Symmetry: C3
């Protein structure tokens, strides 16, 4: 009914997205995605790449989805917000997912490749059945 | 296929909340998407991140199954003299959560600002943006199975 | 299945919303919407009118929609966000769309009438099939109380 397809673009992303078919059994709404690189976020705006191409599918038809902050993105010591509130991904988009993150604080803050700052939410808030992680060399299903 | 039922269940947790949530069934005949929700207590929010308890337990139900909901700011939250925004753009609550609902509010200004018990800074929106049919305001001292 | 109806309220809106029917051939989720006049946004809160009445309809029934920033609204030289994150428009609202924009920088920033800072997204995120731009000088029952 509702499935995601994630393809790592970079060598760094490959370390975090080994090819795999995840069945979403706890029925999580959002698909957490990694930073894939350590980065230092300056006060103000930061362009943050997510190292992945993503396709979402609902009832067998390619559909859009939304990039949303995870609850832990903003903590007391890290005042980080998604510049656009919600990242709206149109079904026709086939490029790399990109983030704009504002560090509202006065000093830089460190993020680690292992962290998931944001989550992918299918158009319509449909809970995903499967999350397909494709090979870098692979071909989008 | 054609028409589904969507309902919210709000249960007050504190004595302050009982003032704003008398046991009641609210019918949503205006077909508003969101469910306004009170602060219940006067609070001073410091610059930066503030964790605000909402004094309620919330369940959302769609087609008879417990579902998630979304916390969204109301227009009244941010005023010229009170630069307030929801921390995570939109709050995302999973159906399994049965704790007290909490806001993450960022005070963007340099000075402390006040929120007041009677204000609704935020509204609850069912997973998938379904218009609620009923808002059930449950008695405080009750055991309810959906929680 | 899912249609937007946009009606310009002001003469400034008419500069950007000529009467026409737009097809959404790319199947984008959002409907880009213009500022309609040049504005100076001071540091802190700014109330910004959008000069339009909008109705959304899905499967023959009036529904809600959401105002969302476009990723181009915020750049290194203009630190702009929507105060409310997402603007929730109830299916019964038939007045002018209004925006609360926070300029997080320390200096006024200039936005131009032709820029589209936000987009409209149907309730439930349904892809729009048609975007109808209605004539200003007309009363339409979809916008009745
Ligand atoms: O946070 C975001 C928002 C959008 N996009 C991509 C997918 C969209 O289809 C495309 C154009 O978006 P606007 O510039 O029209 O918002 O950019 C992102 O990668 N990240
Ligand atoms: O804005 C929010 C986000 C989350 N939660 C609840 C639901 C989650 O299951 C639980 C854990 O969230 P963190 O401790 O990760 O914030 O808190 C809230 O009450 N408000
Ligand atoms: O950014 C926004 C949010 C809301 N509204 C309109 C549509 C809503 O139905 C109405 C009341 O919304 P609150 O004041 O309840 O957010 O205001 C806007 O014009 N712009
Ligand atoms: Mg309201
Ligand atoms: Mg677009």
């Amino acid at each position: 009914a509702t499935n995601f397809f994630i393809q790592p673009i970079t060598e760094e992303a490959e370390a975090y997205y080994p090819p795999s078919v995840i069945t979403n059994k706890r029925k999580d709404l959002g698909v957490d995605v990694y930073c894939c690189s350590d980065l230092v976020l300056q006060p103000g705006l930061n362009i943050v790449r997510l190292h992945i191409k993503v396709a979402c599918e609902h009832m067998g038809k390619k559909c859009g989805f939304k990039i949303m902050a995870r609850s832990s993105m903003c903590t007391h010591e890290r005042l980080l917000i998604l510049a656009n509130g919600i990242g709206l991904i149109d079904p026709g988009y086939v490029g790399e997912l990109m983030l704009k993150i504002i560090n509202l604080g006065d000093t830089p803050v460190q993020i680690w490749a292992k962290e998931c700052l944001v989550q992918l939410v299918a158009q319509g808030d449909h809970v995903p059945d499967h999350i397909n992680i494709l090979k870098r060399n692979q071909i989008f299903p």
